[PDB]
Amino acid sequence: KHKNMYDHTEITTDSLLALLGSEKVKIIDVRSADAYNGWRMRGEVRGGHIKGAKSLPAKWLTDPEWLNIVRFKQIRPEDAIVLYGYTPEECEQTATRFKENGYNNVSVFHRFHPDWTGNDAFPMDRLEQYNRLVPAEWVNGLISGEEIPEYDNDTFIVCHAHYRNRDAYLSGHIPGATDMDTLALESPETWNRRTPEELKKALEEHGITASTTVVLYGKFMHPDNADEFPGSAAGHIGAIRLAFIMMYAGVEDVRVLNGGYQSWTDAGFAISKDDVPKTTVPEFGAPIPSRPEFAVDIDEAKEMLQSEDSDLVAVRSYPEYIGEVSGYNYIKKKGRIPGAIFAEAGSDAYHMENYRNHDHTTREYHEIEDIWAKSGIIPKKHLAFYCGTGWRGSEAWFNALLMGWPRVSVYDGGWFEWSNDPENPYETGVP
Ligand SMILES: C[N+](C)(C)[C@@H](Cc1cnc[nH]1)C(=O)O
Ligand SMILES: [Ca+2]
Ligand SMILES: [Cl-]
Ligand SMILES: [Cl-]
């Protein structure tokens, strides 16, 4: 009877089943976050995670901040740790890592697949709209013309988003993908989405129809706030921003590669540097916009500030919220929109640490949901997410859309449009 760093106690299916409601038990899913979200990566009939389990991919074991990730997830040494993956062998290194850091109650569950997944009496959970947040393997099967799940279309295009930075695409991209500058879909004068006529033309010239499956991704290139255009390095936020605009426009099937470009290279897939020419299409094929409810403008936003069933959600950094900084080198006014619910997004305007993991995949949606619920950000409301110009608000909106929330929007204008009118009220300082 000795603590063994390399020999781990097995917990049975019946034992784990009896502990699903225990507050001191932490069930840890070491598979990829995509599988955790619901993707049936091994052909399992039921995808997702054990109900109540948290996400901690074994891939993160190479992260030097691994222990900080665990502690911020509130996984404490006094908790009973139960690990599972597709196989118990995949949990071995994670079990050792917990034990090496003072966690003495660590077990491995061996029968998640196919025992737990293969019986509908064992409760499981999943991200409702998980098929919109695709893993790298799914994209690779798509461009390879192989049979892939959650895909029934015959037309697709992979789009590499960037903000006035073609080098982000030319330095390395997914094979066959074409680049889309974010200026194709949004105006530099308002930093709002372009008019329906411009969107129709831009989408056609990039080879996108309403019936085309669009797979969007961006490349994170460490934005530096001191640069003139730090947005040129926050490629994946722009990709989700373009996903918002295309879904608003009328593209029926829009996918986002979870984690952006880094997920493609972390999977070990081949990289291309070809400047792929566009293959234009003559007609977009649907009225624009087909989903106008996704976009909220300033008159509706002011109305939502006065409504009981509606709220605006400020997806900005804390220094922006208290008026310490504007967040952008092209915005002079500092402050916040009065009456909006604050949802701290990250360190500055070009990072989304509170909505992402270190590998830029979306944060465990249960954590996003519970943090939102503490501030009254709940699905029974009409919510309009916003930030400075709508990039970060789009990413927060997309996270809510993935949860199946029925009435989420983006207030496009954001702090940029709000503060450009000197007659609009604003608050400042610590609340
Ligand atoms: C609308 N542009 C592309 C000018 C913004 C986009 C943006 C990035 N993070 C928040 N907003 C920028 O880069 O400042
Ligand atoms: Ca604000
Ligand atoms: Cl990014
Ligand atoms: Cl990019």
Ligand SMILES: [Mg+2]
């Ligand atoms: Mg805008």
Ligand SMILES: [Zn+2]
């Ligand atoms: Zn529990």
